[PDB]
Write a protein that binds this ligand. Structure first.
Ligand SMILES: Nc1ncnc2c1ncn2[C@@H]1O[C@H](COP(=O)(O)OP(=O)(O)O)[C@@H](O)[C@H]1O
Ligand SMILES: Nc1ncnc2c1ncn2[C@@H]1O[C@H](COP(=O)(O)OP(=O)(O)O)[C@@H](O)[C@H]1O
Ligand SMILES: [Mg+2]
Ligand SMILES: [Mg+2]
Lengths: 524, 524, 74
């Protein structure tokens, strides 16, 4: 359509005004004395949020030129959100500081590209320093402290995650779900569980548990449909003659087959449970091989050329116990050899390192976890749904932070870590004066998260900043108790991944915005 | 679209204005001197309501920022409505009081999050105190008193429910329906009744009752269709030879089968009634097993491998009498063993405790009630439909209150109970001054339901509040007779569930609203 | 109630206490205290109170029974 072009300072002023609008909404949610932002949803009740990425996504400014600036800073919150779950507000606050100070240098006549080169040079140097200050976190105490800080000082959320990471293991996956009651709960399942029910209720040999339990069973894994008992016969003769209970895995079971199985179980000839294969296509086939590796069995398929009629009792895996519900199937403790399990785990794990789809990478993480370790779900307890949504976001942020803390270690929280790295990098210079100004613009911006937390508390940011900078190592301000002290001892610990990610993403988006000469946008 | 962002006090003032608009409409309907609210319906006549949840749902404020506040307080009325049917006005009145007082503390410079932590601490402590003051209600007198208070001082509604709960039993379900006439009626059915009619009118052996009655019959339960008499023959020979009347249950009956049955009954060979199975799918199958457990019979199905042709007279259950209409089927007094009935009831009852769908939980409640106890329907009598709708809402509220009263006991009504708990909790303090202010904001809000009932009466709320607080135990004001006295003796009793639910839901929604810093909403 | 409202206290509680009290018991807004008003020194002439009530009622009566008002056009 018709395009209106604005040039020079006029474009930059409108661009900054939009950045300032989005940043101001995100800024109010920083630190513990930070307040919530309410986002109207067109259908349903308004959502009260303290997560910056949610606030940033919703805000679209009406003015065309101003909106373009707001959309560009929305990228830092989203990118930080994706790479490491928390750090979305710190990233936006750092980005706003670099743009505001950088625009002043452009007004002073500094070459914008030279400033961008200096800001990148300072950003790279700070990342190396943050790696040096990083201290590895593996102890439960540190995991609980990072969880509590990520959940806005919620100790219960921190300890629940520390306990869960305890039981599930490094391979194990922890998940967040809406809770049944006011109280938070943690459910951990070890062994092979998957979300498929009993085919008929007639198999129920524990009607007081509402379920089927089978003691030391053989397990049969079949490709395609079980069309008839006519395929099944020699295996049925063999298993019955041996005497053990049995679990039938197949992609479906036909009426003749299911009805005959019910007649045999009911009248006592063979003790048999029948369940459906999990998911669809290639991942169903893959998970069936993983189930076979766990049981120490063979997958019967047409591709390998295995008739169901030519299977024997050597070709069935085994487990210590199996338990099955109307929704869920679970297997306790395989006969599969541990070395074979680890070879198959190593295969699956190597494909995680190749996983372009993050959504499917999670599904690969579940397959490793079911084979080795356990999957836990955290019930999020709230009186009302509005409280449930904010409750879950805090729990999710804590799980994301705890995972990053194990991966890259921990550094002092409260923005003390960035104040420390800027102090170390003071002499870092650049080829030209404009690069030197760019290095300083980035160094001054690093103080902005600390100042904003203190401003949200109601303390004057300048006085606290100077005291913290004067102090050395982990000396910092506890915003909650409004007292100075050692941050790591006080328990204000934040991951080195979230701190580094926020700096890198903020610098990237900010450097491009300072260089902008003209803005082209559709006519109002 | 374009979003307008308001920050700080400007956002909170607009947010409070919306809360005040919704609350004011709900407030007029509190207590016995409370007046009705009329809600225009776009098609049909306007609805006159005294239930707050209905008024809250309809109100949507035109101003975008104000509407967001109104939508958020609509949650407390709806949530209280769902968990326990009554208490929707008390919840909204408490929520408005906490928000108005809490916003003043935020204006005084109190940390909003610290206030929320204190309000939650006071809310938890009060709930424990309300459990202590709770006195269990099981006597008919108390059940009638809670029913009368819930129906806005309607004694007839209270006694009808006391009598109904009497006959149906704890397992029994009481239901509310539009009444045939000006007078309210109560119909209680014991035994196995279900809503399916006679297949043909030719079976009518009582044409002066318009119906079929069969004395000491065998009952046959079949899966699928009865296709032919060719399946039926050996059972028909056996039953006729034995000589007893018979009731045929199946999912359908084909023309050849139905016509042959009519020929046999008409000409006197066998006395047989035929009826269709209730509902569809799995719950039809489940209810057919429950019917078999009651009759002391066997369900004939393909899954168990039971041919209709291979059934015998040992495989049929029996009842003392059966009676059937054009709409409804009812069975009087089974031959099924009581211990087997209780085992099957225990199975069904255990699945109630697992029931995620509340709608289907009610359907599980009916199945327990048909097997043990009875289902009653209360006819709601009114001259006009407008009066019918308000009449039924009061009857429904009384049934919800009576159910809660048996479950969690009763405490003094009129808001005297909350005044009492606040007085006990006066010393409860918090870690910081802001938490202490938050505890007091909640303690002062607890007086608001008592004050609003008195204000609706036209009495000045302040004077009565002070007299009630000065009095001890159940000393309280009877708003109707405008006289002070013992509330439990006066008969103003309300459930401990409804009182506790109103406090918990109000505190949850209110605490989040006080913390709001900014509001983002679509441009007008 | 207006004397009490202007001083920032609750009109209803003070009005009830004075109403319940006997004779000159009343609330001195200045000292924020209730006492015998004659002793406390808050004395007003009888004519002042009688005249106020009589004149106020007269305007109220004319007010209630006014059936027309004629004014010049804006
Ligand atoms: N009690 C505290 N005292 C000082 N700093 C804190 C405290 N709690 C959290 N912080 C720090 O404030 C920041 C938390 O910001 P937050 O509100 O969680 O959003 P985001 O991390 O996305 O910026 C982190 O740097 C954290 O270490
Ligand atoms: N005659 C009465 N005297 C004093 N309090 C009463 C009387 N009747 C009902 N109440 C109390 O007023 C409240 C009833 O409010 P209601 O109009 O039924 O709507 P809701 O319960 O949803 O707030 C209860 O606390 C009840 O105990
Ligand atoms: Mg965070
Ligand atoms: Mg009510």
């Amino acid at each position: 359509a018709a395009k209106d072009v604005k040039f020079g300072n006029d474009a930059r002023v409108k661009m900054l005004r939009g950045v300032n609008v989005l940043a101001d909404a995100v800024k109010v949610t920083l630190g513990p004395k930070g307040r919530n932002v309410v986002l109207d949803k067109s259908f349903g009740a308004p959502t009260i949020t303290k997560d910056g990425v949610s606030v940033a996504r919703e805000i679209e400014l009406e003015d065309k030129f101003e909106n373009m600036g707001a959309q560009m800073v929305k990228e830092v919150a989203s990118k930080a959100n994706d790479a490491a779950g928390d750090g979305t507000t710190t990233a936006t606050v750092l980005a706003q500081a670099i743009i505001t100070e950088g625009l002043k240098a452009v007004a002073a006549g500094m070459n914008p590209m030279d400033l961008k080169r200096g800001i990148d040079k300072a950003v790279t140097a700070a990342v190396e320093e943050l790696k040096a200050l990083s201290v590895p976190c593996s102890d439960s105490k540190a995991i609980a402290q990072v969880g509590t800080i990520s959940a806005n000082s919620d100790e219960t959320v921190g300890k629940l995650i520390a306990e869960a990471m305890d039981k599930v293991g490094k391979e194990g996956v922890i998940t967040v779900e809406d809770g049944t009651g006011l109280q938070d709960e943690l459910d951990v399942v070890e062994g092979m569980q998957f979300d498929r029910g009993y085919l008929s209720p007639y198999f129920i040999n524990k009607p007081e548990t509402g379920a089927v339990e089978l003691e030391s069973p053989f397990i049969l894994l079949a490709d395609k449909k079980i069309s008839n008992i006519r395929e099944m016969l020699p295996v049925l003769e063999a298993v019955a003659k041996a005497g053990k209970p049995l679990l039938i895995i197949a992609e479906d079971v036909e009426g003749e087959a299911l009805a005959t199985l019910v007649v045999n179980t009911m009248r006592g000839i063979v003790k048999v449970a029948a369940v459906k294969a999990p998911g669809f296509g290639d991942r169903r086939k893959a998970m069936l091989q993983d189930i076979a590796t766990l049981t120490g069995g063979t997958v019967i398929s047409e591709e390998i050329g295995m008739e169901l009629e030519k299977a024997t009792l050597e070709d069935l895996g085994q487990a210590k116990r199996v338990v099955i519900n109307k929704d869920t199937t679970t297997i306790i403790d395989g006969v599969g050899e541990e070395a074979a399990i680890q070879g198959r785990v190593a295969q699956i794990r190597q494909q995680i390192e190749e996983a372009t789809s993050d959504y499917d990478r999670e599904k690969l993480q579940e397959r490793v976890a079911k084979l080795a370790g356990g999957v836990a779900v955290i019930k999020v307890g709230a009186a009302t749904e509005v409280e449930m949504k904010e409750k879950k976001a805090r729990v999710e942020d804590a799980l994301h932070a705890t995972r990053a803390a194990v991966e890259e270690g921990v550094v002092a929280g409260g923005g003390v870590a960035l104040i420390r790295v800027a102090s170390k990098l003071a002499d870092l210079r650049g080829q030209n004066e404009d690069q030197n100004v760019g290095i300083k613009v980035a160094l001054r911006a690093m103080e902005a998260p600390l100042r904003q937390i203190v401003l949200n508390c109601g303390e004057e940011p300048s006085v606290v900043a100077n005291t913290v900078k004067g102090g050395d190592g982990n000396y910092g301000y506890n915003a909650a108790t409004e007292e100075y002290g050692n941050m790591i001892d006080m328990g204000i610990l934040d991951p080195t991944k979230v701190t580094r990610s926020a700096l890198q993403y903020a610098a990237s988006v900010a450097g491009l915005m300072i260089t902008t000469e003209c803005m082209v946008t559709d006519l109002p």
